[PDB]
Amino acid sequence: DFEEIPEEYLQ
Amino acid sequence: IVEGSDAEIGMSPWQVMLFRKSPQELLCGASLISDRWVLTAAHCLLYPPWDKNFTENDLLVRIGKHSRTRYERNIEKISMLEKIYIHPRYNWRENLDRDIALMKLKKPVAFSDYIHPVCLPDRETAASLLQAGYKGRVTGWGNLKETGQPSVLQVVNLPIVERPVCKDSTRIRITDNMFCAGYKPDEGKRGDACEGDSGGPFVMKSPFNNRWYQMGIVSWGEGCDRDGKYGFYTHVFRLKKWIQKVIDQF
Amino acid sequence: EADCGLRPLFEKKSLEDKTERELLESYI
Ligand SMILES: COc1ccc(C(=O)Nc2ccccn2)cc1
Ligand SMILES: *[C@@H]1O[C@H](CO)[C@@H](O)[C@H](O)[C@H]1NC(C)=O
Ligand code: NA
Ligand code: NA
């Protein structure tokens, strides 16, 4: 459903 | 938001999306009150009946958004949480009394055309504007109907309702820390918050100084946009001493 | 903040959004 956000925000 | 319309670009630059990291999904709305503080409903973070008790690392906030689902490159900013603060007397057991929480961001967010804080009311602005019939504005990316989901941020303007009418619409015990808003069945016009809008702002534009103030937080409703029902909102001014205490201390 | 509640694309430019007048008209 949601576009993946940049990986930097998940680290 | 039910029976609202698409927001204009930059119409609600204090709007924040509370976003679950995994699975990636919308949890709630929220609002930007300074470069480091975000306001939301306590029940967005803590609701034991539903096994909800998020920690900081579970969540992100997305600021400057318009599209619900898109990653808005060069426009939105995504912030990590330093600390969650729930009102110590938030009543999740009964009626969501004092449904308010603050989130401190790890780093300040840069303001832009799309990102800007809302004011919190002073006693006088609250006394003047929190009157039955006076309209505020609710924004969010929640569902379009009770029983679907918007492409972009939705907006609806709704009148504050007389307290006896609020109380008489529900079996839930209504407190001074709540107000309700919405049209009456006979008023023709419609609109409400719905699932995913909670935690977002109910704002009013002061006619005295032409600034937007956050008078409410989308708190709860029995259904969405039902005739004879009203949406309930946390009374921000009534809880402002707690907000100030948290910000002053932390 | 000193600048709170004033939107860059609206109040700061003296542009009105499409429905803010509905709010003003209710403040009677
Ligand atoms: C005015 O604030 C709200 C907040 C939440 C809701 C809401 O999700 N209602 C709902 C959704 C599904 C089934 C029953 N009821 C409505 C108004
Ligand atoms: C929620 O989580 C925190 C930390 O894990 C915990 O200390 C707290 O007691 C929990 N609150 C409730 C009502 O379960
Ligand atoms: Na009642
Ligand atoms: Na209703």
Domain ranges of chain B: 1-12+118-237, 13-117+238-250
Element (H, E) at C20: helix C20-26
Contacts of A8 (CB under 8 A, 6+ apart): none
Note the residue count of chain C: 28
CATH 3.40.50.720 assigned to B1-12+118-237 = no
Q: Of the CATH numbers 3.40.50.300, 1.10.1370.30, 3.60.40.10, 2.40.10.10, which one belongs to the domain with range B13-117+238-250?
A: 2.40.10.10
Residue B149 Cα to ligand 3 middle (Å): 31
Q: Which residues of A touch B148 (CB under 8 A)?
A: none
Resolution limit, Å: 1.2
CATH of the domain at C10: 4.10.140.10
Q: Are strands B212-220 and B154-159 parallel, antiparallel or unpaired?
A: unpaired
Cα gap B157→B204, rounded to integer Å: 9
Question: What is the DSSP secondary structure assignment for residue C18, as one 8-state letter?
Answer: S
Q: How far apart are CA B73 and CA B71, in angstroms?
A: 6
- CB under 8 Å to B110, separation ≥6 — which residues? B35, B77
Overall domain count for chain C: 1
> Which residue from B100, B113, B112, B119 is spatially nearest to B33, judged by alpha carbons?
B119
SS3 annotation, chain B: CECCEECCCCCCCCEEEEEECCCCEEEEEEEECCCCEEEECHHHCEEHHHCEECCHHHEEEEECCCECCCCCCCCCEEEEEEEEEECCCCECCCCCECCCEEEEECCCCCCCCCCCCCECCCHHHHHHHCCCCCEEEEEECCCCCCCCCCCECEEEEEEECCHHHHHHCCCCCCCCCEEEECCCHHHCCCCECCCCCCCCEEEEECCCCCCEEEEEEEEECCCCCCCCCCEEEEECHHHHHHHHHHHHHC
| Nearest-CA distance B209 → chain C (Å) | 10
Question: Distance (Å, rounded) from C-alpha B178 to C-alpha B136?
Answer: 15
Q: Which domain holds residue C24?
A: 1-28
Cβ(B244) to ligand 2 under 6 A? no
